Coordinates of C-alpha atoms and ligand atoms in Angstrom, one line a residue:
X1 CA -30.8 -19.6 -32.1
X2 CA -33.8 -20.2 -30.0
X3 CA -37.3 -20.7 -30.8
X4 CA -39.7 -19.9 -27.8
X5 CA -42.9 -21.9 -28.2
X6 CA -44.1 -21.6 -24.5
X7 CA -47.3 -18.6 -23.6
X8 CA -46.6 -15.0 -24.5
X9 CA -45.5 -12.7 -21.2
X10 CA -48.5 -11.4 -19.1
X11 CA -48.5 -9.8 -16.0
X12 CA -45.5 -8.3 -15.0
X13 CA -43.3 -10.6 -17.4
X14 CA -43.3 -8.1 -20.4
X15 CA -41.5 -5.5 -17.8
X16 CA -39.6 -7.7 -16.4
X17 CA -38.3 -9.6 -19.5
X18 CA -37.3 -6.0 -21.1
X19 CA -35.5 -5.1 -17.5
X20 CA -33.0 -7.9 -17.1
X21 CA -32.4 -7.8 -21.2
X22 CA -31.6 -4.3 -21.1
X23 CA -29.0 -4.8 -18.0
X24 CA -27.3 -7.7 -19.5
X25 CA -26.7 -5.9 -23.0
X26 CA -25.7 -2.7 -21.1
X27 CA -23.4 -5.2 -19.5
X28 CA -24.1 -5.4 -15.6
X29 CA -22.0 -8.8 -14.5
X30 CA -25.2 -9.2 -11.8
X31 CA -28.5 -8.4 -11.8
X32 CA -31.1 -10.1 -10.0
X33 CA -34.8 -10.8 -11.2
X34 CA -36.8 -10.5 -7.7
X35 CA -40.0 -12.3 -8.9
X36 CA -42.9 -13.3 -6.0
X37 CA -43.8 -17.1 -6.1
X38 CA -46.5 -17.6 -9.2
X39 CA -44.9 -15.3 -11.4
X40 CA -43.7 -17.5 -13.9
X41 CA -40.0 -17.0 -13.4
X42 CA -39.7 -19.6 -16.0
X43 CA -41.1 -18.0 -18.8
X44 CA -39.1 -14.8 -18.0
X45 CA -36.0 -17.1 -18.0
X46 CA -36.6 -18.4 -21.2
X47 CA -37.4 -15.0 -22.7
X48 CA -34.2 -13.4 -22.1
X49 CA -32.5 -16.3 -23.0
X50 CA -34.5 -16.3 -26.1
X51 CA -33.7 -12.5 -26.8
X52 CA -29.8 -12.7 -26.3
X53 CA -29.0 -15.8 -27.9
X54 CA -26.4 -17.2 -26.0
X55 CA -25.9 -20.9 -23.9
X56 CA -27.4 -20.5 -20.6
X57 CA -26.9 -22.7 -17.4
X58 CA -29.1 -22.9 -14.9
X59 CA -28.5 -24.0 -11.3
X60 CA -31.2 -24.9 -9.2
X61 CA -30.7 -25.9 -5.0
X62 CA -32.2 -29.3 -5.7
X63 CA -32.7 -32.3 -7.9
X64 CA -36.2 -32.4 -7.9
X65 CA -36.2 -29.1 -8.7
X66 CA -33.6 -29.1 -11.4
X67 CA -35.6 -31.7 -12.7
X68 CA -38.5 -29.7 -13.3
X69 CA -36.7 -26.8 -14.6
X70 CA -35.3 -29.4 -17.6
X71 CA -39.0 -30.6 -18.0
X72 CA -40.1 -26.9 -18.2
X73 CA -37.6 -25.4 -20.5
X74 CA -37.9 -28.2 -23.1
X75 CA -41.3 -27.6 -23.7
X76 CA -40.9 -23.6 -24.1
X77 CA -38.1 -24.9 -26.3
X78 CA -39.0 -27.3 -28.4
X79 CA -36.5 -27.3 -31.5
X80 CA -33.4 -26.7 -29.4
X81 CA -31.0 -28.7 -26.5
X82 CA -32.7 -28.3 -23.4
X83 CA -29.9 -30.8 -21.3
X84 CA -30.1 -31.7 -17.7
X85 CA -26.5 -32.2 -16.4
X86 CA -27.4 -35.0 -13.2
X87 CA -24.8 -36.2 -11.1
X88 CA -24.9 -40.1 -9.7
X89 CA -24.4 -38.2 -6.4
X90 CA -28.1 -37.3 -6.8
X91 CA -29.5 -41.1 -6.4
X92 CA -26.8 -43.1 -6.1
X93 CA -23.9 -43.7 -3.2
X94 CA -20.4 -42.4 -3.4
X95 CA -17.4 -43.9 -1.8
X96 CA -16.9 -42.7 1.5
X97 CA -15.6 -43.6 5.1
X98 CA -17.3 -43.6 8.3
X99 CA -15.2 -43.3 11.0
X100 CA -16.9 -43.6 13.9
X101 CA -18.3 -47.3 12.9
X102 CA -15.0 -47.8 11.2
X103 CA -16.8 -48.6 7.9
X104 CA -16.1 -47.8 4.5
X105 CA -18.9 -47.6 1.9
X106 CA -18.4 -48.4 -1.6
X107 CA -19.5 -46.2 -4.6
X108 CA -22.7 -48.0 -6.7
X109 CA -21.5 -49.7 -9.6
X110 CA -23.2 -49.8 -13.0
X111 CA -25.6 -47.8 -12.2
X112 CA -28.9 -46.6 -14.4
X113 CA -27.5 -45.7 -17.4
X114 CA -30.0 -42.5 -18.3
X115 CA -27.4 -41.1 -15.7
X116 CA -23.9 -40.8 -17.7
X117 CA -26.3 -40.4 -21.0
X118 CA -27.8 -37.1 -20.0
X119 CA -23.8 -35.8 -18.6
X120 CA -22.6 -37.0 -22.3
X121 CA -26.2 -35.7 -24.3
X122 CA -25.1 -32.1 -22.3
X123 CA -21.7 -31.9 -23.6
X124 CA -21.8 -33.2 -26.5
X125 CA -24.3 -30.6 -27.9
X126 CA -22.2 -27.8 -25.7
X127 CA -19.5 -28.6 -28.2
X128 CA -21.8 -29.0 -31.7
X129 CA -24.2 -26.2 -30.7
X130 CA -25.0 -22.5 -29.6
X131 CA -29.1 -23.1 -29.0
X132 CA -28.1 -25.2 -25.3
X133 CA -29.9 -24.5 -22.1
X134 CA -28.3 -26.9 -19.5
X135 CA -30.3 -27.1 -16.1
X136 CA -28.4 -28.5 -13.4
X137 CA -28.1 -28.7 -8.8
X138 CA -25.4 -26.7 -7.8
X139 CA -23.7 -29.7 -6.7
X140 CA -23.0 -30.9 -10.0
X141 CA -20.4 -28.3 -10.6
X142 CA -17.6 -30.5 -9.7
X143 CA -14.4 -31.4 -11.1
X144 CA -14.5 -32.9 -14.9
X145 CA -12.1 -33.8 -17.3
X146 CA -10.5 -30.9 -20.3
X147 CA -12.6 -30.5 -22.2
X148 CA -9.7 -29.5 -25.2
X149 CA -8.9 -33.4 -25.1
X150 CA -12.6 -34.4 -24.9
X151 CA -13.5 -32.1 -28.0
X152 CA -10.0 -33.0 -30.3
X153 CA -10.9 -36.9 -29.7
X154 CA -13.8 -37.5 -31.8
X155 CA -14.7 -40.0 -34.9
X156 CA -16.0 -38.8 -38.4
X235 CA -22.7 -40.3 -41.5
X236 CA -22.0 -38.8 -38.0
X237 CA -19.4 -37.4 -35.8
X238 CA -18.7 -40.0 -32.8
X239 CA -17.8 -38.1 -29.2
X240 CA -15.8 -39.9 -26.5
X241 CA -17.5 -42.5 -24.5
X242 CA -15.3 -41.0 -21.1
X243 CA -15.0 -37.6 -19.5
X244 CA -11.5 -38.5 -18.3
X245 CA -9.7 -39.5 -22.1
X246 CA -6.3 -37.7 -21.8
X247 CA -4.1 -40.6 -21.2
X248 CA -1.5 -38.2 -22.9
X249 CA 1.2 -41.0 -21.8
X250 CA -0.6 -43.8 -19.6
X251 CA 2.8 -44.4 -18.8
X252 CA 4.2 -41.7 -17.8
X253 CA 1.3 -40.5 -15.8
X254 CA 0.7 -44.2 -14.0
X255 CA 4.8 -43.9 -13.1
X256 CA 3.7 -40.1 -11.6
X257 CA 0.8 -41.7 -9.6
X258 CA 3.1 -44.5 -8.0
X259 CA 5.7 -42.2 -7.1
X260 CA 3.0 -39.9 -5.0
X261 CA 2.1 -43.7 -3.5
X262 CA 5.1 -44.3 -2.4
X263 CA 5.9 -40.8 -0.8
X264 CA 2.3 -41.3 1.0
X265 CA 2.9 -44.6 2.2
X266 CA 6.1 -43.6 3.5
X267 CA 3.8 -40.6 5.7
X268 CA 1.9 -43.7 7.2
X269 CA 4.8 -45.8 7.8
X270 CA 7.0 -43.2 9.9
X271 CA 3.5 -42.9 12.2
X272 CA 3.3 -46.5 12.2
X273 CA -0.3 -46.1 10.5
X274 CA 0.7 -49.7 8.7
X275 CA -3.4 -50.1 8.4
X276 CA -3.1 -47.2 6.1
X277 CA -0.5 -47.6 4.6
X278 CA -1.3 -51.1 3.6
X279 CA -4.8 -50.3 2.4
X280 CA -3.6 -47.3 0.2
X281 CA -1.4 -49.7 -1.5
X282 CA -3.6 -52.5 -1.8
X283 CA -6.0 -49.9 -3.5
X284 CA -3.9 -47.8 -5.7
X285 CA -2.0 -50.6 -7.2
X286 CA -4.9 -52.0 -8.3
X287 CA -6.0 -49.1 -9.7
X288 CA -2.6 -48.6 -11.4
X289 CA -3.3 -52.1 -13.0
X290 CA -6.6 -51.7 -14.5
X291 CA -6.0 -48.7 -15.6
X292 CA -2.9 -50.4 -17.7
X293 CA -4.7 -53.2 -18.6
X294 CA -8.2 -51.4 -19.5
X295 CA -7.3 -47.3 -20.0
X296 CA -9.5 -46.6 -17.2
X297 CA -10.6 -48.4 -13.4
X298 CA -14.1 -47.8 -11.1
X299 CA -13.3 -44.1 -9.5
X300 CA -11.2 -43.1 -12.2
X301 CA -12.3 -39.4 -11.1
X302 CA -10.0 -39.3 -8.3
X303 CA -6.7 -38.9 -10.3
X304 CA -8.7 -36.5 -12.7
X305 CA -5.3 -33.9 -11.9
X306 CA -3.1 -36.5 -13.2
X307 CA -5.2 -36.9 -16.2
X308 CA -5.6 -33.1 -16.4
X309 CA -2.4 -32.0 -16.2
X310 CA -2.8 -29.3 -13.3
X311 CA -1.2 -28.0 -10.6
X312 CA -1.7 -29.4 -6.8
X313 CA -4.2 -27.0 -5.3
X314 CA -5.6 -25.5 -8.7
X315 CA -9.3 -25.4 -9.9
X316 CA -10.2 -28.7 -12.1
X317 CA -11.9 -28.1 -14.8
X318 CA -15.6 -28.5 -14.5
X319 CA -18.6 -28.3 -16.6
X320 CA -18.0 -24.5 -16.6
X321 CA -15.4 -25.3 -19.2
X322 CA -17.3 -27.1 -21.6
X323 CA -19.3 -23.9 -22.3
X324 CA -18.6 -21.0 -25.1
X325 CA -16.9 -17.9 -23.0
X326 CA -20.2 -15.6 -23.7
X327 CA -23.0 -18.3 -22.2
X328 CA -25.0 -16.8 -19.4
X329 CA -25.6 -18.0 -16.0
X330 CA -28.8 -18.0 -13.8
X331 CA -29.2 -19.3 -10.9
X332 CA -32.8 -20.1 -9.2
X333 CA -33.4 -19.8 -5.6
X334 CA -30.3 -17.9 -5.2
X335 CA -31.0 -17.1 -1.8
X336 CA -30.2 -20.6 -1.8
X337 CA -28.3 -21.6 -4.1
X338 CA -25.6 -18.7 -3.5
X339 CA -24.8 -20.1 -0.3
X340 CA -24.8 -23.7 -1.5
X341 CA -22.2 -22.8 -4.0
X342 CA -20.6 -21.2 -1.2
X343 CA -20.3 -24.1 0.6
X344 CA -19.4 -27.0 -1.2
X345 CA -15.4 -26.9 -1.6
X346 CA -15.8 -27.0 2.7
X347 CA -18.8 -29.4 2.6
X348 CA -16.6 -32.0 -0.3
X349 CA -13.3 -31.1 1.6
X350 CA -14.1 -32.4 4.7
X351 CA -15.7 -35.9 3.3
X352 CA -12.5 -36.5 1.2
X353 CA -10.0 -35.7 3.4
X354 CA -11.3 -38.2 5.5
X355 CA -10.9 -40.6 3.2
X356 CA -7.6 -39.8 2.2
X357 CA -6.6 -39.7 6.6
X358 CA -7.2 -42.9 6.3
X359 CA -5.2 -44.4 3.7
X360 CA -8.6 -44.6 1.0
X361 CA -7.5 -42.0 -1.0
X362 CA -4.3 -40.3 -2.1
X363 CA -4.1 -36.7 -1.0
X364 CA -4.1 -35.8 -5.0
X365 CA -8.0 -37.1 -4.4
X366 CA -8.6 -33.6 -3.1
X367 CA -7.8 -32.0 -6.0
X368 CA -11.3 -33.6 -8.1
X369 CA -13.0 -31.2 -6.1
X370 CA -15.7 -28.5 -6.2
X371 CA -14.8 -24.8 -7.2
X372 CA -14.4 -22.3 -4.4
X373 CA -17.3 -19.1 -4.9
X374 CA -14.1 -16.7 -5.9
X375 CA -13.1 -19.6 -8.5
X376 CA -16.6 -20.2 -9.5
X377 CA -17.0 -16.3 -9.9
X378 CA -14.1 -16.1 -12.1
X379 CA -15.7 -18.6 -14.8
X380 CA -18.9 -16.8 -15.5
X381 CA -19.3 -13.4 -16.7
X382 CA -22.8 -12.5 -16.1
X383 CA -25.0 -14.2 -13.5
X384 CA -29.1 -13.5 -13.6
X385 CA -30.0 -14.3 -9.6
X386 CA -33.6 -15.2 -9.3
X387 CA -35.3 -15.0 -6.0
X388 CA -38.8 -14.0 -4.1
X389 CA -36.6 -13.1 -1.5
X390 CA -33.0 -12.5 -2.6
X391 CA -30.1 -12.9 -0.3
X392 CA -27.0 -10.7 1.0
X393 CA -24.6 -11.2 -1.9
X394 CA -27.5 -10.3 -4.5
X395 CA -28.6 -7.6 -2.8
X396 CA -25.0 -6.1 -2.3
X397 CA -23.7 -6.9 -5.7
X398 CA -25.9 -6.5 -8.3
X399 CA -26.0 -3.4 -10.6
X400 CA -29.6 -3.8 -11.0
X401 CA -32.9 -5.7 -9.3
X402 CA -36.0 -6.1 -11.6
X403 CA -39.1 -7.0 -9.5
X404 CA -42.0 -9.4 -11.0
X405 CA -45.0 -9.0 -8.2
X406 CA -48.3 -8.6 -10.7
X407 CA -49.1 -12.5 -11.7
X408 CA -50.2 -13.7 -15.2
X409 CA -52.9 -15.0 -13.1
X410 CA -54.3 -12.5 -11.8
X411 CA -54.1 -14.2 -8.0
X412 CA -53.1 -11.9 -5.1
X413 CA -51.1 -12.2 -2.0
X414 CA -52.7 -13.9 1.1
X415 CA -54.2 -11.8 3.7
X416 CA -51.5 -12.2 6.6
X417 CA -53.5 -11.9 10.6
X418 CA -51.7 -11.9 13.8
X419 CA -53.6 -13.9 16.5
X420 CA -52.8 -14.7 20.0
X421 CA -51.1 -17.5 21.9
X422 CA -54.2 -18.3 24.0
X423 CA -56.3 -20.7 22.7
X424 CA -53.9 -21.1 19.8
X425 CA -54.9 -24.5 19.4
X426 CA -58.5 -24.6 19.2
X427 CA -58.7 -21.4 17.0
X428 CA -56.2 -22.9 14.8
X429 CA -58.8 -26.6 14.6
X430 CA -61.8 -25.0 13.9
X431 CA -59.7 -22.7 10.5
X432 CA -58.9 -26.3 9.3
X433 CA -62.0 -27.7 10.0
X434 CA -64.2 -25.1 8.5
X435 CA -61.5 -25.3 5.5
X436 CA -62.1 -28.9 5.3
X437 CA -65.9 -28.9 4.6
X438 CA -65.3 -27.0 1.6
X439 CA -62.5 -28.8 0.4
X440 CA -59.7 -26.4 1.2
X441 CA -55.9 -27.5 2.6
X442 CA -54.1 -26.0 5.9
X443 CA -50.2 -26.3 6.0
X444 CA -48.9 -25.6 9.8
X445 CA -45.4 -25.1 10.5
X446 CA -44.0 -25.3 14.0
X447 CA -40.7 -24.8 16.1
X448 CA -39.9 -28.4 17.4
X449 CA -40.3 -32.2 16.5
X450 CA -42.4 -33.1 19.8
X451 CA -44.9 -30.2 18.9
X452 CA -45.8 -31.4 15.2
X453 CA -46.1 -35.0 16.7
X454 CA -48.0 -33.8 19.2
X455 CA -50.2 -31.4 17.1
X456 CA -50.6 -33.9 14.2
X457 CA -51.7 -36.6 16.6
X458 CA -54.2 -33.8 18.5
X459 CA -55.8 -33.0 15.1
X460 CA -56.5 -36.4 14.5
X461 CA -58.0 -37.1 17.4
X462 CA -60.0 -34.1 16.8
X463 CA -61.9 -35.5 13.0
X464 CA -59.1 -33.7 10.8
X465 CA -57.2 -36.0 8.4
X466 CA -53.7 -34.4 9.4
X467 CA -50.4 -36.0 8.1
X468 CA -46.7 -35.3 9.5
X469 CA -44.1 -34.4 7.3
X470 CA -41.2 -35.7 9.6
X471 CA -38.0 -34.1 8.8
X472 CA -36.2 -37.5 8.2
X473 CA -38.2 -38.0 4.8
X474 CA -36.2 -38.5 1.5
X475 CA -37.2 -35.9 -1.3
X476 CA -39.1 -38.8 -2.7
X477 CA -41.2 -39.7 0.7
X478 CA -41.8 -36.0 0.7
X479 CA -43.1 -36.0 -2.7
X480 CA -45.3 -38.8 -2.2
X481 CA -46.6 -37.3 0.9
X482 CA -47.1 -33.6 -0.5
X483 CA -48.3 -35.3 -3.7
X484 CA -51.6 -36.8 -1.8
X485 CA -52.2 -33.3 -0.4
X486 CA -52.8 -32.2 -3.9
X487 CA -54.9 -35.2 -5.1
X488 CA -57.1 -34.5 -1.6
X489 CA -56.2 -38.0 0.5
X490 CA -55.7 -35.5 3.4
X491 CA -56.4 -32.3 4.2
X492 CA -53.7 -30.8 6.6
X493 CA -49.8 -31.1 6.8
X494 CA -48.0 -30.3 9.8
X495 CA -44.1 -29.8 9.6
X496 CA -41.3 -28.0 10.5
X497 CA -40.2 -27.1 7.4
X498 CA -42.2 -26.0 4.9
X499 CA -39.7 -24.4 2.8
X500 CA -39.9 -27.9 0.4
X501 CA -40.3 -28.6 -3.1
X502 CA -44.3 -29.0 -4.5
X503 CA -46.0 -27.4 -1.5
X504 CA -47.5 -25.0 -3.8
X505 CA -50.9 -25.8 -4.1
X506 CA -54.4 -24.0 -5.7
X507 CA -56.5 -25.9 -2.8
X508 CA -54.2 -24.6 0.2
X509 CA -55.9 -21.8 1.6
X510 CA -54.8 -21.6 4.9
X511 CA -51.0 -21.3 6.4
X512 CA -50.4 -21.3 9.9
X513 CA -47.0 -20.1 11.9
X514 CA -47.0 -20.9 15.2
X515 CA -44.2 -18.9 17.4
X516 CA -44.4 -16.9 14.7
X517 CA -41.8 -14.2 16.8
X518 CA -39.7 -17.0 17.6
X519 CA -35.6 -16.6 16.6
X520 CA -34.1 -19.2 14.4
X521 CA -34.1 -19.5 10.4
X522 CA -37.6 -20.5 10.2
X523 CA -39.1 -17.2 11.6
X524 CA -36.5 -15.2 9.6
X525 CA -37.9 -12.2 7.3
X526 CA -36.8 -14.0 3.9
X527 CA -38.3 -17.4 5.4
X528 CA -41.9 -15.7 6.9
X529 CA -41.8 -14.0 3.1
X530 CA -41.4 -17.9 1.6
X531 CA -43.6 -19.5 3.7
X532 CA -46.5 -16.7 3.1
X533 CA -46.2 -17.6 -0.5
X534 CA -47.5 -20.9 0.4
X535 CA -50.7 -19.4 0.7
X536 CA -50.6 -17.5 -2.8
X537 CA -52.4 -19.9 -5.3
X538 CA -56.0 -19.6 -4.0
X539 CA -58.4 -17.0 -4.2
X540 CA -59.3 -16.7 0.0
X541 CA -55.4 -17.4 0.9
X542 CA -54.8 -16.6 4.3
X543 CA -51.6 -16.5 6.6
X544 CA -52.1 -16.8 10.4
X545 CA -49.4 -16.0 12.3
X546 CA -49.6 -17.0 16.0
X547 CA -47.6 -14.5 18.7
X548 CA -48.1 -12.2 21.2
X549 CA -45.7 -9.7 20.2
X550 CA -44.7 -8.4 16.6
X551 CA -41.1 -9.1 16.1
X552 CA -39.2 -7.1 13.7
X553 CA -39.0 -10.3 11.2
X554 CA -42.9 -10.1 11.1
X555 CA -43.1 -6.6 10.7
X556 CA -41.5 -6.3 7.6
X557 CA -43.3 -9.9 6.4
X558 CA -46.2 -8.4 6.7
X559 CA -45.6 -4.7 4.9
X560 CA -43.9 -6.9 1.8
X561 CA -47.1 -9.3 1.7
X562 CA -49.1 -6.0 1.8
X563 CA -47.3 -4.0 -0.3
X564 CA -47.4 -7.1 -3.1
X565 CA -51.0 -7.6 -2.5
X566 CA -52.0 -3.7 -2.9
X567 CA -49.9 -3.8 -6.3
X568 CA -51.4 -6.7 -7.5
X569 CA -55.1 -5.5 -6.8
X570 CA -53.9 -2.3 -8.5
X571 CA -53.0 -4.2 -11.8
X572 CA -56.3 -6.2 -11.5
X573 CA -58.5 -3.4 -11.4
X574 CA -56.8 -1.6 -14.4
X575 CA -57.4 -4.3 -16.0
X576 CA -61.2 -5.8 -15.3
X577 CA -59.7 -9.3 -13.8
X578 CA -61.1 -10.5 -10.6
X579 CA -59.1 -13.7 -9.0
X580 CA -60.3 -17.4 -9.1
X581 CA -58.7 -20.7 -7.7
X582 CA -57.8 -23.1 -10.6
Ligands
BOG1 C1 8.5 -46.4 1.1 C2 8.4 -47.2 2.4 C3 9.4 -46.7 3.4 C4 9.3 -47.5 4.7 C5 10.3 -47.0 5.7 C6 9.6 -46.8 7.0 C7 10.4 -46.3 8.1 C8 9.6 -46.1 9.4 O1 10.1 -44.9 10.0 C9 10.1 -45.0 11.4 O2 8.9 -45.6 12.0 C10 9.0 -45.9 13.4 C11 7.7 -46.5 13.8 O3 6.6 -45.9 13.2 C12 9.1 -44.5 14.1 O4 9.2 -44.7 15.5 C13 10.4 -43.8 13.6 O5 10.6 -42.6 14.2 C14 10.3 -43.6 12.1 O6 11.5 -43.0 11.6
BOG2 C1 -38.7 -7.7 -1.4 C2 -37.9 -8.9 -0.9 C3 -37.3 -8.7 0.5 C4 -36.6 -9.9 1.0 C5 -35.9 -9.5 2.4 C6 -34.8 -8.6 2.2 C7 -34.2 -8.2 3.5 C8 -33.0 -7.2 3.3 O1 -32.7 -6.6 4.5 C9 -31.8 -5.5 4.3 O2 -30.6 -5.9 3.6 C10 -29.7 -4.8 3.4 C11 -28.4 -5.3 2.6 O3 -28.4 -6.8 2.6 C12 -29.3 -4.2 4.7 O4 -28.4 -3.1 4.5 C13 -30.5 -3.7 5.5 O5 -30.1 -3.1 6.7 C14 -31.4 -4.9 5.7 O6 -32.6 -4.5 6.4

């Protein structure tokens, strides 16, 4: 049983809390929490899973992200198992094989340890308790080992859990004489195309496999014969983390206008990296089958899902059974005031916002179309007394942090990129946002991404949006009506109520 320790609900949390609760006990299998950036989806998350008492997991597009989710959540939760399921995937190499340099990369070896600790920590309290929140990236739903052999294995002071994901050795034996014989047959499929590279290398490396494994129980990549070890059929679901939980937890999953599609396409995304692998005589092609689940599979091992979005996507909006909007902050802070402005003299109009914003200490974010444009904008402004940095689209989420965090301590005062849509970019001292080609096509100028990017400019008391075109398009149109229709709402709320915004 949960004990919520975080802020009570303001704004429109109370409403919002009572919504989604009310759906899920009814028993709608989706229903979406459409809550505008500031709202505190957090604290509305942890309220419903406070009110119906039951494991949650939460997925997250990111690391960083999923990070911060774990961080959150175990403050609101003190006195329970807030777990953070990572995956080595998310810092550290894999095995793979590059082809076109003819170069195979080996997965890191003994790597931080924190990482298997917090996978272990995660299930081992899935199995001893019901008061679990497990934050996680979508990408670390992945094949892992049954989790019937992982819970009957245990040592009775204190109760001692396996040290391994992958324990079923059933009968070593008999399951190292099933892995030769599909050797053997694959070898045989290189051979008769005179592949003798492959077939040499997939021998070389499976029968040392075979070998440790004999001589130690387990080898480096043990993962990739998880359906031996599993007992499954060629082509079936593994087991994943999924598995691990009781059948009634409850599933939400954060950005789903992102993550949906992310979980959409991972079995195509992991597919294609380890088929190469096993093309070239790396990998047997039982490999495949420690996999990612397909959407229909993953679909088929939840039983409700809570999407949460500012701007949810097609599946949400076409399957769930009910939508709860959040749009009235705990703060008090309102949408940004969203201006068209023409092309001409773009440039100029655009330095003189940022300088005027400068003097007083406020921060411009500018997002443009193409990489020669920010370079050349960025390098303009500079030129021009503004202390503008470029967030180059090659960055690592760390670089990126690094760079966005001196934005929020004040080292510059303007970031120019492409895409804004990133992690920490959500700052009290940005006041101005500027879209150039604003009526542009591509994914950047799309309604849901003008509605995200607007947001930027939601955490100060003056935030403006200026959008540069000479033309409304229809993406902009209906930007603009949400923005307003969220900002009229929120003044509504504020003047029921005797609060008049301020920048933190
Ligand atoms: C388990 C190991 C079995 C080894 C037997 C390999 C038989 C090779 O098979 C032969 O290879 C030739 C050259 O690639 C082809 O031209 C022939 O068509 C093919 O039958
Ligand atoms: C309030 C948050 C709004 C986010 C942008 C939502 C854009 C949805 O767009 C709408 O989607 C429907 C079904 O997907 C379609 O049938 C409509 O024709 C389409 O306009």
């Amino acid at each position: 049983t949960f004990r919520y320790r975080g802020p009570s609900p303001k704004g429109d949390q109370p409403k919002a809390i009572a919504g989604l609760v009310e759906a899920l006990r009814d028993g709608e299998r989706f229903v979406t929490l459409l809550g505008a950036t500031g709202t505190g989806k957090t604290v509305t998350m942890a309220k419903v899973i406070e009110a119906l008492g039951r494991p949650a997991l939460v997925l997250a597009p990111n690391k960083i992200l999923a990070a911060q989710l774990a961080a959150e959540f175990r403050e609101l939760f003190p006195e329970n198992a807030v777990e953070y399921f990572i995956s080595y995937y998310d810092y550290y190499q894999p095995e793979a094989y590059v082809p076109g340099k003819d170069l195979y990369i080996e997965k890191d070896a003994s790597i931080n340890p924190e990482i298997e600790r917090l996978r272990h920590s995660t299930t081992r309290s899935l199995l001893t308790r019901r008061d679990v929140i497990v934050v996680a990236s979508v990408s670390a739903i992945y094949g892992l080992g049954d989790p019937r052999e992982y819970r009957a294995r245990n040592l009775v002071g204190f109760v001692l859990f396996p040290a391994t994901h992958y324990l079923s050795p059933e009968g070593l034996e008999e399951i190292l004489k099933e892995i030769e014989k599909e050797l053997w047959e694959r070898v045989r499929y290189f051979e008769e195309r005179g592949e003798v590279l492959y077939a040499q290398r997939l021998k070389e490396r499976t029968l040392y496999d075979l070998e440790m494994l004999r001589v130690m129980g387990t080898c480096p990549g043990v993962e990739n014969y998880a359906r031996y070890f599993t007992g499954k059929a060629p082509g079936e679901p593994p087991y994943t983390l999924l598995d691990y939980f009781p059948e009634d937890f409850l599933v939400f999953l954060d950005e789903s206008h992102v993550t949906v599609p992310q979980l959409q396409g991972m079995y195509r995304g992991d597919y294609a990296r380890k088929k190469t692998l096993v093309d070239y005589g790396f990998r047997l092609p039982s490999a495949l089958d420690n996999r990612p689940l397909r959407f229909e599979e993953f679909l088929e091992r939840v039983s409700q899902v809570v999407f949460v979005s500012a701007t949810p996507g097609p599946f949400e909006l076409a399957h769930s059974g009910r939508v709860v909007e959040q749009i009235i902050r705990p703060t008090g802070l309102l949408d940004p005031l969203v201006r068209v402005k023409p092309t001409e003299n773009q440039i100029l109009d655009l330095m003189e916002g940022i300088r005027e914003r400068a003097a007083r200490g406020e921060r411009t974010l500018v997002t443009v179309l193409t990489v020669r444009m920010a370079e050349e904008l960025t390098s303009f402004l500079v030129e021009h007394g503004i202390r503008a940095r470029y967030l180059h689209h090659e960055l690592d989420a760390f670089k990126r942090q690094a760079l966005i965090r001196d934005l929020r301590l004040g080292h510059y005062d303007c970031l120019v990129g492409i895409n804004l849509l990133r992690e920490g970019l959500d700052i009290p001292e940005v006041s101005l946002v500027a879209i150039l080609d604003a009526d542009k096509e591509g994914f950047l100028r799309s309604e849901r991404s003008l509605i995200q990017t607007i947001g930027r400019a939601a955490r100060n008391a003056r935030g403006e949006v200026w959008l540069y075109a000479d033309r409304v398009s229809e993406a902009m149109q209906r930007a603009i009506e949400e923005t307003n229709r969220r900002r009229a709402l929120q003044e509504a709320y504020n003047l029921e109520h005797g609060i008049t915004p301020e920048t933190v």
